[PDB]
């Protein structure tokens, strides 16, 4: 009864999030263990994306890469920033009301 319950909970997570993580992973391929760059994953909906893009761009200038791929709704979006411009990017999301 614990094993069956564990499988259902497990299956539930796997079902929700296989496509978002798949999209986010591709986006930050090799970028999750390079000291050089820092990446921040976050979820965006179609309506939400223009505002976010403008908001990042004032915070983080033109020394950033924002690429996104579409899961089945909106997009899980990934921003790539230099290490120590991490805070500038997070402030921009927090201020928008966008969670990680």
């Amino acid at each position: 009864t614990r094993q069956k319950q564990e499988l259902e909970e497990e299956l539930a997570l796997a079902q929700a999030y296989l496509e978002p993580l798949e999209r986010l992973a591709a986006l930050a391929h090799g970028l999750d263990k390079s000291p050089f760059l820092r990446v921040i994953p976050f979820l965006l909906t179609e309506k939400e994306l223009p505002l976010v893009e403008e908001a990042l761009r004032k915070a983080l200038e033109d020394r950033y890469l924002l690429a996104h791929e579409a899961y089945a709704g909106g997009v899980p979006a990934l921003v790539v920033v230099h290490r120590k411009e991490v805070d500038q990017a997070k402030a921009a999301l927090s201020r928008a009301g966008v969670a990680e």
């Binding site: 391929h29 970028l31 050089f36």
Partner: protein, 48 residues
Amino acid sequence: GLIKSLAEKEKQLLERLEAAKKEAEERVKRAEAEAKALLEEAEAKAKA
């Protein structure tokens, strides 16, 4: 953007460190070789 620009650039930034470690080691080895042989000449001479 597109991640293929920075993805395939990283694997050149990586080569720029790597060739650096080479020519650091391979230079300090020569000097050690020149010191070793110099102090050997200083024996061959001293004993002669």
